[PDB]
RNA sequence: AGAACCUUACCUGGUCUUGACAUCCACGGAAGUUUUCAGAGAUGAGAAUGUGCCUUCGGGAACCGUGAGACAGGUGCUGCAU
RNA sequence: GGCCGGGAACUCAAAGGAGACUGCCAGUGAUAAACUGGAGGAAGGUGGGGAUGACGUCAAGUCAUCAUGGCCCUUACGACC
RNA sequence: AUGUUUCUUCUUUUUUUUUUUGGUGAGAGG
């Protein structure tokens, strides 16, 4: 239930603490012993955490799996910096401002394509 | 960004039967300094919050002038009620002045070569209403290119 | 003549009185000489300690005191001797041993007092007081407390002649006596003057 | 729909339903509108002549059906037609259907 | 929310001036205690005698004197200084 | 002599609440607001009353409740009887 | 019907935490 009430966040930037550091994940803590997972893939590429760091990041996917984490969170992928521009810019949370598109090599370089319906503001 | 610059302030009143509430009106202008020009009519009841409140209408009044060579185009009559201020054409002069409170107006703007005088009663209200308005149906060449002739370089020699 | 204190018509019935203890008419007077001028001594030492209520509760034959600030470590100081220092010097006053509660409180500014003196501690040396409310005012406000009128007084600004002004933000109730705000004051006594304060801060509700 | 009476009174809670209904027909289906549209249909400038003002001040291109009484000061699509008719407005908003059938693909 | 002394800050007269009260400085007196008085009372002039606890036991906190004091005291004014 | 038993009915004693809202009926009135009659009830329209004194005016009073800038007395305007 | 004189102002700069199960007696192995 307290997932359920926390649909924003199953899909909004998740702040977590991380427990543990693995070669191939990292295990973060949520609270209220929810655990969420960053895979290799999720993480950006010149980022090292420590155990006790504080990380945000997208959850893209809950899983109901009967082992393993069930939580999937993202700094890779584009949802996140589609994220982290919604909470930077009130025009875009919002709905003043739209982003329709947003292409992203992570740690690196990204491109988002913004649009507005009012003439009065410049999106950019 | 928007190139803030902030000049007025005097006390209003209103006097009611508690007394009367000194009200501030507070004028100032925006623009980017090579083209876009566009001031916000701005009043509180005290003086911060008045130059904040007359930022949201000078961002949606900046009009373009189309700024030839970060100067005029020709000498254009800024008569409006209160000030009847010619904008004299000087050609790369490489002189900054125009009008007191007038020429913090025209530093946003961007220019550097231009005379003024402001004809008549020496207000500063009517100044930033018309030196957006002389600045408003003055047009470059191309565009009184555009519509008399109908020969665009004839005019252009 | 105006302002009553929200206060004191609204002890008890939604917030707890600031001493709570029997007497008889004939043991009136002794129990109350010891509040006083002790709470005068703990002012004068723990006005740099942050506090913000000072209950005062002796039964029969006992006396304790609940100190509510936020930074006890230097009413503690180092290793609770200083909390003893509090002890020695009110057990020979009153004759019956007064032991002290330091209980505090996670939040320091969301409280009536330390607003209070946040401004007289820094009244001094001349401050635009404005911003120097404005910054506390604006912290509280959207730390949760969802109503406030903050006040200050004296000669403002180096004046002379009379000047008071209020900075409302939120709920203020005076007609309310269900809702929930404080309010508490101190003075700020110099080579100028007396510059002094108060504050309505509101919390909520039932 | 589920509470909204054992929380307080049932007196008061018809003052609620007034001013839910009364700000539901007033605000529509439009609670879930993006704020600031692209565009905003109008049928008669006479009394709804503050969204014409209001709509040209943004940069938003908005329409007008026109009859003999009403000026074009202000407005952008000057479209003659008798704003006085049940079936023939919705023959106009028959029409638009077409183009908004359009307007989705 | 109560003018015989008091209250009382006003007046007459008689008085001490580091003072009714506070903290500190040197030293003394221990502190304490009843009573005879010049006198309106104030104040000041006296006689009998006493001495709990800690003892780092070359003496100290609780009380007063005499001397220098910093100050203390202000119902003396300004409510248009707050 | 409720004085001596008895009683938990009952006045009184004191607590947490139940009790009121134009809820219902009809006329009128713009299907609204709303006044006021009909009903029962302990009470009928904020049931009787108190407490709470908005922004502010008198730059209204107080330095003699207390605080406190300057001022003066500080062998006195301070102190005692 | 009458109601002195000289007297009242005006807003954009200040703000560290945090806490230092032993003994005795006998026997035996090397």
């Given at each position: 239930?307290?997932?359920?009430?926390?649909?924003?966040?199953?899909?909004?930037?998740?702040?977590?603490?991380?427990?543990?550091?693995?070669?191939?994940?990292?295990?973060?803590?949520?609270?209220?012993?929810?655990?969420?997972?960053?895979?290799?893939?999720?993480?950006?590429?010149?980022?090292?955490?420590?155990?006790?760091?504080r990380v945000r990041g997208v959850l893209?996917?809950?899983?109901?799996?009967?082992?393993?984490?069930?939580?999937?969170?993202?700094?890779?992928?584009?949802?996140?910096?589609?994220?982290?521009?919604?909470?930077?810019?009130?025009?875009?949370?919002?709905?003043?401002?739209?982003?329709?598109?947003?292409?992203?090599?992570?740690?690196?370089?990204?491109?988002?394509?913004?649009?507005?319906?009012?003439?009065?503001?410049?999106?950019? | 960004?928007?190139?803030?610059?902030?000049?007025?302030?005097?006390?209003?009143?209103?006097?009611?039967?508690?007394?009367?509430?000194?009200?501030?009106?507070?004028?100032?202008?925006?623009?980017?300094?090579?083209?876009?020009?566009?001031?916000?009519?701005?009043?509180?009841?005290?003086?911060?919050?008045?130059?904040?409140?007359?930022?949201?209408?000078?961002?949606?009044?900046?009009?373009?002038?189309?700024?030839?060579?970060?100067?005029?185009?020709?000498?254009?009559?800024?008569?409006?009620?209160?000030?009847?201020?010619?904008?004299?054409?000087?050609?790369?002069?490489?002189?900054?002045?125009?009008?007191?409170?007038?020429?913090?107006?025209?530093?946003?703007?961007?220019?550097?070569?231009?005379?003024?005088?402001?004809?008549?009663?020496?207000?500063?209200?009517?100044?930033?209403?018309?030196?957006?308005?002389?600045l408003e149906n003055m047009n470059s060449?191309?565009?009184?290119?555009?519509?008399?002739?109908?020969?665009?370089?004839?005019?252009?020699? | 003549?105006?302002?009553?204190?929200?206060?004191?018509?609204?002890?008890?019935?939604?917030?707890?009185?600031?001493?709570?203890?029997?007497?008889?008419?004939?043991?009136?007077?002794?129990?109350?000489?010891?509040?006083?001028?002790?709470?005068?001594?703990?002012?004068?030492?723990?006005?740099?300690?942050?506090?913000?209520?000072?209950?005062?509760?002796?039964?029969?034959?006992?006396?304790?005191?609940?100190?509510?600030?936020?930074?006890?470590?230097?009413?503690?100081?180092?290793?609770?001797?200083?909390?003893?220092?509090?002890?020695?010097?009110?057990?020979?006053?009153?004759?019956?041993?007064?032991?002290?509660?330091?209980?505090?409180?996670?939040?320091?500014?969301?409280?009536?007092?330390?607003?209070?003196?946040?401004?007289?501690?820094?009244?001094?040396?001349?401050?635009?007081?404005?911003?120097?409310?404005?910054?506390?005012?604006?912290?509280?406000?959207?730390?949760?407390?969802?109503?406030?009128?903050?006040?200050?007084?004296?000669?403002?600004?180096?004046?002379?002649?009379?000047?008071?002004?209020?900075?409302?933000?939120?709920?203020?109730?005076?007609?309310?006596?269900?809702?929930?705000?404080?309010?508490?004051?101190?003075?700020?006594?110099?080579?100028?003057?007396?510059?002094?304060?108060?504050?309505?801060?509101?919390?909520?509700?039932? | 729909?589920?509470?909204?009476?054992?929380?307080?009174?049932?007196?008061?809670?018809?003052?609620?339903?007034?001013?839910?209904?009364?700000?539901?027909?007033?605000?529509?289906?439009?609670?879930?509108?993006?704020?600031?549209?692209?565009?905003?249909?109008?049928?008669?400038?006479?009394?709804?002549?503050?969204?014409?003002?209001?709509?040209?001040?943004?940069?938003?291109?908005?329409?007008?059906?026109?009859?003999?009484?009403?000026?074009?000061?202000?407005?952008?699509?000057?479209?003659?037609?008798?704003?006085?008719?049940?079936?023939?407005?919705?023959?106009?908003?028959?029409?638009?259907?077409?183009?908004?059938?359009?307007?989705?693909?």
């Open positions: 239930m307290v997932v359920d009430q926390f649909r924003e966040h199953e899909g909004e930037i998740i702040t977590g603490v991380v427990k543990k550091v693995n070669r191939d994940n990292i295990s973060l803590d949520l609270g209220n012993n929810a655990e969420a997972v960053i895979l290799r893939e999720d993480m950006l590429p010149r980022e090292n955490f420590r155990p006790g760091d893209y996917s809950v899983r109901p799996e009967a082992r393993g984490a069930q939580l999937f969170v993202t700094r890779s992928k584009p949802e996140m910096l589609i994220e982290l521009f919604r909470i930077e810019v009130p025009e875009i949370g919002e709905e003043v401002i739209e982003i329709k598109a947003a292409a992203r090599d992570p740690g690196s370089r990204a491109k988002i394509a913004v649009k507005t319906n009012d003439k009065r503001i410049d999106p950019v | 960004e928007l190139q803030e610059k902030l000049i007025a302030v005097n006390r209003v009143s209103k006097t009611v039967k508690g007394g009367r509430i000194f009200s501030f009106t507070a004028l100032t202008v925006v623009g980017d300094g090579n083209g876009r020009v566009g001031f916000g009519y701005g009043k509180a009841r005290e003086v911060p919050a008045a130059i904040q409140k007359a930022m949201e209408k000078a961002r949606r009044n900046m009009i373009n002038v189309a700024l030839n060579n970060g100067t005029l185009q020709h000498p254009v009559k800024g008569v409006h009620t209160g000030s009847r201020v010619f904008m004299q054409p000087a050609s790369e002069g490489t002189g900054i002045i125009a009008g007191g409170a007038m020429r913090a107006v025209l530093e946003v703007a961007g220019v550097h070569n231009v005379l003024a005088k402001a004809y008549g009663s020496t207000n500063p209200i009517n100044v930033v209403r018309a030196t957006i308005d002389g060449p191309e565009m009184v290119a555009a519509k008399r002739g109908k020969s665009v370089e004839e005019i252009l020699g | 003549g105006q302002k009553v204190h929200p206060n004191g018509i609204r002890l008890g019935i939604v917030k707890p009185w600031n001493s709570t203890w029997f007497a008889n008419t004939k043991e009136f007077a002794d129990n109350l000489d010891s509040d006083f001028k002790v709470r005068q001594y703990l002012t004068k030492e723990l006005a740099k300690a942050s506090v913000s209520r000072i209950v005062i509760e002796r039964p029969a034959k006992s006396i304790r005191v609940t100190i509510h600030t936020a930074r006890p470590g230097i009413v503690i100081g180092k290793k609770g001797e200083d909390v003893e220092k509090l002890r020695k010097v009110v057990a020979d006053i009153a004759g019956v041993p007064a032991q002290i509660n330091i209980a505090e409180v996670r939040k320091p500014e969301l409280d009536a007092k330390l607003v209070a003196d946040s401004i007289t501690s820094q009244l001094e040396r001349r401050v635009m007081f404005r911003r120097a409310m404005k910054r506390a005012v604006q912290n509280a406000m959207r730390l949760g407390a969802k109503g406030i009128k903050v006040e200050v007084s004296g000669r403002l600004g180096g004046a002379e002649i009379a000047r008071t002004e209020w900075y409302r933000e939120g709920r203020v109730p005076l007609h309310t006596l269900r809702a929930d705000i404080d309010y508490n004051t101190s003075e700020a006594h110099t080579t100028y003057g007396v510059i002094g304060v108060k504050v309505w801060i509101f919390k909520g509700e039932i | 729909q589920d509470g909204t009476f054992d929380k307080l009174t049932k007196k008061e809670a018809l003052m609620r339903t007034r001013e839910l209904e009364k700000l539901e027909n007033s605000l529509g289906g439009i609670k879930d509108m993006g704020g600031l549209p692209d565009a905003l249909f109008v049928i008669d400038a006479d009394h709804e002549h503050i969204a014409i003002k209001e709509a040209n001040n943004l940069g938003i291109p908005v329409f007008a059906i026109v009859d003999t009484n009403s000026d074009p000061d202000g407005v952008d699509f000057v479209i003659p037609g008798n704003d006085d008719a049940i079936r023939a407005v919705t023959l106009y908003l028959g029409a638009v259907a077409a183009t908004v059938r359009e307007g989705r693909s």
